[PDB]
């Protein structure tokens, strides 16, 4: 558990998990070691991927003790894990901070036809409706620039779990898939970590013309199938496919 | 690894998706709305802001004619207010989705043990082969061409008709193609799936594990003949059924009755059986009826196939098995809800001829049969050629004691595989039971046991 936690922490030292305002809840143990008695947001995320990586060893084990059936974990697996976290958290950053900054744009934009509006004036009943219509979009852009603030405290825990799911939820059925992740949701609520509450994974990980296309290239509607091909997807180790019909294929 | 391998819990989320899709259409579109809140709403949210912003680009600010960007703005601001609405509802229409969900939970629940009571009847005999396509099949009858959904829309009584109809044709489908006996075997086990489902009836649990295996547990210590009508071993049955809570009283019951033992020589004891088992409250007809069949499996076990056939009488409706009671009519059997992709397999047990019921229903719907003998190597090349010639128009090939080589049934179970350009073609397959019969050819097509 210890060296999970320091290969964690230093693989996610790139990424900026700082959160100041982040406030400290009570309990959620799992490394017994934990640098400060208090731990910090990047230090509670660290704790969070090791606990996801031990909870997959106890499933594990448990399924085995109920039936067998069970594929070995490997730091491998953690690695990918790791992995996917990263690249999952860049990506929605980059695109976020993208749409923001097209939000500013937009918003310089339309200042200057404001100012193109008050130059014309200088027929006043178009001009009633400009004027009108010009404060509804300056509040709705505003609430748009808060919520994208908002949005962006979210991103931690919600690709956390995302990653958690690409890497490690495979080889599980649907149950075991939507226990696992109700795990994970429960320890990262537990050490309060804001994660976008009842998120679902698909349209979080695949877009509509990613899934237009899947369904185009015959593939089911069913959940579970959208989840594989998100697997399939969104990739670091060649996938394995297990299909008792050919329709993976 | 990425697993697409179908189980319990796999099945159970599809058929609440298909039929939430069919039996609420309206709670599957606030579905769809919710889950694009996530992703497409603020997406074309933004694309038609966008849209805004080169029309801003465009007009320069004109104000001649204002109309130009007005209605933009206006289409933005509707947009927004619909996703405003959408968001600040998505707690009432998530709890609302969530019953409806747990309205049509035990649904699924009894469609995935059907199918994987149905795909595991592989133990009982070999001939026993259905695909997940059967199933699925069974279930987009019983949704759409279901004639006893034509009228009720009261949402209520629809899932009831829906289950009923449901069983009934999950039965009908299967026991066409499953012995005599082992009709009886699949009906107790849809009585127990329906039992789990059905509400406000206890799960019976120990009376069910009591009736499998609880009569065999050692009591050898104790056996006493009792009075002189009980003989020594539905003396021990008494025993063993005198281990279950319900019944322990039994020993100075049938003391007390004096009428017993005239039900004991009776020509059917089941049709009306005393009042034995203790409990307070006044149990209902499915707990009435397994303590009258852990009885029937004490005393006198040779009415154990008629109690059970009561017992789904009172579980899975009166005259459930009626459909395999009338003649068999396979003309709406191959006229609808058989695609041609799949061949009706026809088996049959040893000393016993099934090519007249085939004849005589395409005597029945005017259709030409290209009928072949397969034992030749010539039978082979004129049986390819009569399947080469009837998927271009559609005539009716029809081979004859084809399970002498199963090799030939590799070829044509993978030539099958192909879609075939012709709709009205059918193809069938006059075999005998046996053990060499491909099981893929099984899987792939529907089989009729005569």
């Known amino acids: 558990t210890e060296a999970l936690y320091q290969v964690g922490k230093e693989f996610t030292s790139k990424m900026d998990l700082e959160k100041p305002n982040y406030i400290v809840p009570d309990y959620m143990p799992v490394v017994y070691d934990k640098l400060p008695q208090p731990p910090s947001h990047r230090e509670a995320i660290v704790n969070s991927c090791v606990f996801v990586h031990q909870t997959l060893h106890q499933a594990n084990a448990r399924l085995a003790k109920r039936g067998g059936r069970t594929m070995a974990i490997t730091p491998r697996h953690y690695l990918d894990f790791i992995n996917h976290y990263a690249n999952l958290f860049h990506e929605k950053r980059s695109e976020l901070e993208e749409q923001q900054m097209h939000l500013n744009v937009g918003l310089r934009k339309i200042k200057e036809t404001v100012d193109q509006v008050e130059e014309l004036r200088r027929k006043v009943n178009r001009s009633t409706a400009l004027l009108k219509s010009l404060s509804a979009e300056r509040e709705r852009w505003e609430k748009t620039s808060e919520t994208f603030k908002n949005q962006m405290s979210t991103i931690a825990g919600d690709c956390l779990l995302s990653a958690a799911f690409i890497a490690y939820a495979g080889y599980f059925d649907q149950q075991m898939r939507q226990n696992l992740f109700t795990t994970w949701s429960h320890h990262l609520q537990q050490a309060n970590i804001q994660f976008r509450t009842d998120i679902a994974r698909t349209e979080y990980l695949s877009n509509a013309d990613e899934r237009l296309r899947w369904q185009a290239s015959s593939l089911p509607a069913d959940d579970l199938c959208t989840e594989n091909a998100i697997m399939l997807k969104r990739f670091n180790r060649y996938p394995l496919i297990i299909d008792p019909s050919g329709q993976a294929t | ?450």
């Open chain 2, 1 to 450: 690894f990425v697993n697409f391998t179908v189980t319990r819990s796999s099945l159970q989320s599809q058929c609440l998706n298909e039929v939430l899709k069919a039996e609420r259409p309206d709670v599957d579109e606030k579905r769809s709305d919710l889950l694009k809140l996530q992703g497409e709403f603020q997406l074309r949210l933004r694309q038609l802001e966008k849209s805004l912003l080169q029309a801003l680009n465009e007009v320069k600010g004109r104000i001649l004619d204002d109309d130009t960007i007005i209605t933009t703005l206006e289409n933005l601001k509707r947009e927004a207010a619909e996703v405003t609405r959408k968001v600040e509802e998505t707690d009432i229409v998530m709890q609302e989705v969530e019953t409806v969900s747990q309205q049509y939970l035990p649904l699924s629940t009894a469609c995935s043990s059907i199918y994987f009571t149905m795909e595991s009847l592989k133990q009982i005999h070999f001939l026993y082969q259905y695909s997940l396509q059967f199933f699925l099949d069974i279930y987009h009858n019983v949704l759409y061409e279901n004639p006893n959904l034509k009228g009720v829309t009261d949402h209520t009584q629809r899932l009831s008709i829906i289950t009923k109809d449901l069983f009934q044709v999950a039965f009908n489908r299967v026991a066409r193609g499953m012995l005599h006996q082992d009709h009886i075997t699949f009906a107790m086990l849809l009585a127990r799936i329906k039992l789990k489902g059905t509400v406000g009836e206890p799960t019976y649990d120990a009376e069910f594990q009591h009736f499998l295996r609880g009569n065999e547990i050692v009591l050898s210590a104790g056996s006493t003949p009792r009075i002189q009508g009980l003989t020594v071993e539905q003396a021990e049955a008494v025993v063993r059924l005198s281990c279950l809570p319900a019944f322990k009283d039994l020993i100075a019951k049938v003391q007390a009755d004096e009428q017993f033992g005239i039900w004991l020589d009776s020509s059917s004891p089941e049709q009306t059986v005393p009042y034995l088992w203790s409990e307070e409250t006044p149990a209902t007809p499915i707990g009435q009826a397994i303590h009258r069949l852990l009885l029937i499996q004490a005393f006198r076990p040779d009415r154990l196939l008629a109690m059970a056939h009561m017992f789904v009488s009172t579980n899975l409706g009166e005259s459930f098995m009626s459909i395999m009671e009338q003649p068999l009519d396979l003309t709406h059997i191959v006229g609808t809800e058989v695609k041609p992709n799949t061949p009706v397999l026809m088996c049959s047990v040893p000393g016993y001829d099934a090519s007249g019921h085939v004849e005589d229903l395409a005597a029945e719907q005017n259709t030409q049969i290209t009928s072949i003998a397969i034992g030749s190597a010539e039978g082979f090349n004129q049986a390819d050629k009569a399947i080469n010639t009837a998927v271009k128009s559609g005539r009716w090939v029809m081979l004859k004691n084809v399970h002498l080589a199963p090799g030939w049934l590799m070829q044509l179970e993978k030539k099958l595989h192909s879609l075939q350009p012709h709709a009205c073609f059918r193809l069938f397959l006059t075999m005998e039971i046996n053990p060499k019969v491909p099981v893929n050819l099984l899987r792939a097509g529907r089989i009729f046991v005569f």
